[PDB]
Design a protein around this motif. Structure first.
Motif, PDB file in Angstrom:
ATOM      1  N   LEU A   1       0.832  -1.274  -0.062  1.00  0.00           N
ATOM      2  CA  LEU A   1      -0.146   0.118   0.062  1.00  0.00           C
ATOM      3  C   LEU A   1       0.954   1.364   0.031  1.00  0.00           C
ATOM      4  O   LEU A   1       0.311   2.259  -0.580  1.00  0.00           O
ATOM      5  CB  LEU A   1      -0.744   0.013   1.309  1.00  0.00           C
ATOM      6  CG  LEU A   1      -2.250  -0.615   1.066  1.00  0.00           C
ATOM      7  CD1 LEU A   1      -3.062  -0.876   2.391  1.00  0.00           C
ATOM      8  CD2 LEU A   1      -3.151   0.370   0.210  1.00  0.00           C
ATOM      9  N   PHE A   2       1.889   1.106   0.674  1.00  0.00           N
ATOM     10  CA  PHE A   2       2.863   2.186   0.730  1.00  0.00           C
ATOM     11  C   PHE A   2       3.369   2.533  -0.732  1.00  0.00           C
ATOM     12  O   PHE A   2       3.628   3.818  -1.049  1.00  0.00           O
ATOM     13  CB  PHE A   2       4.037   2.029   1.688  1.00  0.00           C
ATOM     14  CG  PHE A   2       5.050   3.098   1.970  1.00  0.00           C
ATOM     15  CD1 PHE A   2       6.037   3.355   1.096  1.00  0.00           C
ATOM     16  CD2 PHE A   2       5.080   3.741   2.919  1.00  0.00           C
ATOM     17  CE1 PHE A   2       7.153   4.485   1.128  1.00  0.00           C
ATOM     18  CE2 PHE A   2       5.736   4.881   3.164  1.00  0.00           C
ATOM     19  CZ  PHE A   2       7.088   5.006   2.407  1.00  0.00           C
ATOM     20  N   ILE A   3       3.816   1.584  -1.254  1.00  0.00           N
ATOM     21  CA  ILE A   3       4.403   1.699  -2.725  1.00  0.00           C
ATOM     22  C   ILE A   3       2.875   2.277  -3.706  1.00  0.00           C
ATOM     23  O   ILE A   3       3.231   3.231  -4.648  1.00  0.00           O
ATOM     24  CB  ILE A   3       4.834   0.465  -3.371  1.00  0.00           C
ATOM     25  CG1 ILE A   3       6.089   0.033  -2.403  1.00  0.00           C
ATOM     26  CG2 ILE A   3       5.425   0.720  -4.584  1.00  0.00           C
ATOM     27  CD1 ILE A   3       7.044   0.867  -2.412  1.00  0.00           C
ATOM     28  N   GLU A   4       1.894   1.730  -3.324  1.00  0.00           N
ATOM     29  CA  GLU A   4       0.662   2.144  -4.254  1.00  0.00           C
ATOM     30  C   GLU A   4       0.528   3.718  -4.023  1.00  0.00           C
ATOM     31  O   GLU A   4       0.112   4.420  -5.015  1.00  0.00           O
ATOM     32  CB  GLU A   4      -0.495   1.370  -3.868  1.00  0.00           C
ATOM     33  CG  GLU A   4      -1.632   1.591  -4.609  1.00  0.00           C
ATOM     34  CD  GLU A   4      -3.027   1.021  -4.011  1.00  0.00           C
ATOM     35  OE1 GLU A   4      -2.771   0.012  -3.439  1.00  0.00           O
ATOM     36  OE2 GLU A   4      -4.155   1.351  -4.466  1.00  0.00           O
ATOM     37  N   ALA A   5       0.805   4.206  -2.988  1.00  0.00           N
ATOM     38  CA  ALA A   5       0.600   5.731  -2.330  1.00  0.00           C
ATOM     39  C   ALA A   5       1.301   6.514  -3.075  1.00  0.00           C
ATOM     40  O   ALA A   5       0.966   7.497  -3.800  1.00  0.00           O
ATOM     41  CB  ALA A   5       0.747   5.975  -1.217  1.00  0.00           C
ATOM     42  N   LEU A   6       2.526   6.005  -3.430  1.00  0.00           N
ATOM     43  CA  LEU A   6       3.470   6.806  -4.195  1.00  0.00           C
ATOM     44  C   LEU A   6       3.196   6.633  -5.560  1.00  0.00           C
ATOM     45  O   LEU A   6       3.436   7.691  -6.561  1.00  0.00           O
ATOM     46  CB  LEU A   6       5.169   6.238  -3.829  1.00  0.00           C
ATOM     47  CG  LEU A   6       5.557   6.551  -2.547  1.00  0.00           C
ATOM     48  CD1 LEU A   6       6.850   5.836  -2.188  1.00  0.00           C
ATOM     49  CD2 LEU A   6       5.830   7.790  -2.066  1.00  0.00           C
ATOM     50  N   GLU A   7       3.098   5.468  -6.001  1.00  0.00           N
ATOM     51  CA  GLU A   7       2.439   5.219  -7.666  1.00  0.00           C
ATOM     52  C   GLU A   7       1.527   5.956  -7.913  1.00  0.00           C
ATOM     53  O   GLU A   7       1.472   6.596  -9.113  1.00  0.00           O
ATOM     54  CB  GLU A   7       2.175   3.539  -7.915  1.00  0.00           C
ATOM     55  CG  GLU A   7       3.340   2.782  -7.713  1.00  0.00           C
ATOM     56  CD  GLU A   7       2.806   1.281  -8.173  1.00  0.00           C
ATOM     57  OE1 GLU A   7       2.164   0.712  -7.252  1.00  0.00           O
ATOM     58  OE2 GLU A   7       3.153   0.974  -9.184  1.00  0.00           O
ATOM     59  N   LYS A   8       0.219   6.165  -7.163  1.00  0.00           N
ATOM     60  CA  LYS A   8      -0.556   7.159  -7.275  1.00  0.00           C
ATOM     61  C   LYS A   8      -0.493   8.553  -6.798  1.00  0.00           C
ATOM     62  O   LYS A   8      -1.468   9.314  -7.070  1.00  0.00           O
ATOM     63  CB  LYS A   8      -2.209   6.336  -6.779  1.00  0.00           C
ATOM     64  CG  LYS A   8      -2.167   5.057  -7.500  1.00  0.00           C
ATOM     65  CD  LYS A   8      -3.427   4.289  -6.849  1.00  0.00           C
ATOM     66  CE  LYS A   8      -3.330   2.879  -7.318  1.00  0.00           C
ATOM     67  NZ  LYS A   8      -4.675   2.153  -7.042  1.00  0.00           N
ATOM     68  N   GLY A   9       0.593   8.802  -6.213  1.00  0.00           N
ATOM     69  CA  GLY A   9       0.667  10.234  -5.601  1.00  0.00           C
ATOM     70  C   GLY A   9      -0.430  10.400  -4.754  1.00  0.00           C
ATOM     71  O   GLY A   9      -1.013  11.689  -4.706  1.00  0.00           O
ATOM     72  N   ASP A  10      -1.090   9.442  -3.822  1.00  0.00           N
ATOM     73  CA  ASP A  10      -2.226   9.646  -3.007  1.00  0.00           C
ATOM     74  C   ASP A  10      -1.829   9.938  -1.524  1.00  0.00           C
ATOM     75  O   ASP A  10      -1.364   8.909  -0.904  1.00  0.00           O
ATOM     76  CB  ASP A  10      -3.089   8.500  -3.199  1.00  0.00           C
ATOM     77  CG  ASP A  10      -4.379   8.542  -2.572  1.00  0.00           C
ATOM     78  OD1 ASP A  10      -4.572   9.399  -1.368  1.00  0.00           O
ATOM     79  OD2 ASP A  10      -5.173   7.791  -2.875  1.00  0.00           O
ATOM     80  N   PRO A  11      -1.789  10.946  -0.998  1.00  0.00           N
ATOM     81  CA  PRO A  11      -1.382  11.144   0.110  1.00  0.00           C
ATOM     82  C   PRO A  11      -2.252  10.670   1.413  1.00  0.00           C
ATOM     83  O   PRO A  11      -1.687  10.140   2.625  1.00  0.00           O
ATOM     84  CB  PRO A  11      -1.250  12.760   0.614  1.00  0.00           C
ATOM     85  CG  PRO A  11      -1.612  13.447  -0.831  1.00  0.00           C
ATOM     86  CD  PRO A  11      -2.244  12.351  -1.654  1.00  0.00           C
ATOM     87  N   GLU A  12      -3.432  10.621   1.213  1.00  0.00           N
ATOM     88  CA  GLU A  12      -4.529  10.105   2.055  1.00  0.00           C
ATOM     89  C   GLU A  12      -4.242   8.656   2.551  1.00  0.00           C
ATOM     90  O   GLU A  12      -4.419   8.022   3.463  1.00  0.00           O
ATOM     91  CB  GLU A  12      -5.786  10.422   1.645  1.00  0.00           C
ATOM     92  CG  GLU A  12      -6.302  11.949   1.859  1.00  0.00           C
ATOM     93  CD  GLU A  12      -5.929  12.758   3.002  1.00  0.00           C
ATOM     94  OE1 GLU A  12      -5.828  12.038   3.979  1.00  0.00           O
ATOM     95  OE2 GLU A  12      -5.066  13.833   2.745  1.00  0.00           O
ATOM     96  N   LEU A  13      -3.984   7.843   1.212  1.00  0.00           N
ATOM     97  CA  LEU A  13      -3.532   6.382   1.263  1.00  0.00           C
ATOM     98  C   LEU A  13      -2.307   6.157   2.077  1.00  0.00           C
ATOM     99  O   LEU A  13      -2.437   5.374   2.797  1.00  0.00           O
ATOM    100  CB  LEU A  13      -3.477   5.910  -0.269  1.00  0.00           C
ATOM    101  CG  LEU A  13      -3.400   4.764  -0.617  1.00  0.00           C
ATOM    102  CD1 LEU A  13      -4.597   3.725   0.171  1.00  0.00           C
ATOM    103  CD2 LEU A  13      -3.512   4.234  -1.994  1.00  0.00           C
TER     104      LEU A  13
END
Length: 123
Positions: A11-23
């Motif tokens: 999920l941490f990587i996903e956040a970076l992939e999607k540039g999603d701060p809330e994630l």
């Protein structure tokens, strides 16, 4: 199918992939430490970091990852404005949250493996 430890790191990587701060907020804790090529972030700073990625328009793509002992090693392709790099991301999860993340930029898949071994041993 995926264990909670793996889900967290992924999920941490996903956040970076999607540039999603809330994630990112959901995955980190106030004592989560990230070190990006020597630069230390803690807690919310890590979320701010993600906000910067998005702002910059930086593109993180996950290539593959593996488990070495109790740390997770991700190999990510990163792109900024017509330029491409491999980044190595080593994550330690403790009690379902990210304890420590090490990020390092490398110049070939061979040096990736080297950095991964090195950073894993620090995590």
């Amino acid at each position: 199918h995926m264990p909670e430890e793996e889900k967290a790191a992924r999920l941490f990587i996903e956040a970076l992939e999607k540039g999603d701060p809330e994630l990112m907020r959901k995955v980190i804790s106030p004592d989560t430490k990230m070190v990006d090529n020597g630069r230390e972030f803690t807690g919310d700073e890590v979320v701010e970091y993600v906000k910067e990625i998005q702002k910059r328009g930086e593109q993180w793509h996950l290539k593959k990852y593996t488990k070495i002992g109790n740390v997770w090693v991700f190999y990510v392709q990163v792109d900024n404005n017509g330029q491409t790099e491999i980044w190595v991301v080593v994550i330690k999860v403790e009690n379902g949250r990210i304890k420590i993340v090490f990020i390092q930029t490398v110049r070939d898949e061979e040096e990736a493996h080297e950095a991964a071994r090195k950073l894993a041993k620090q995590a």
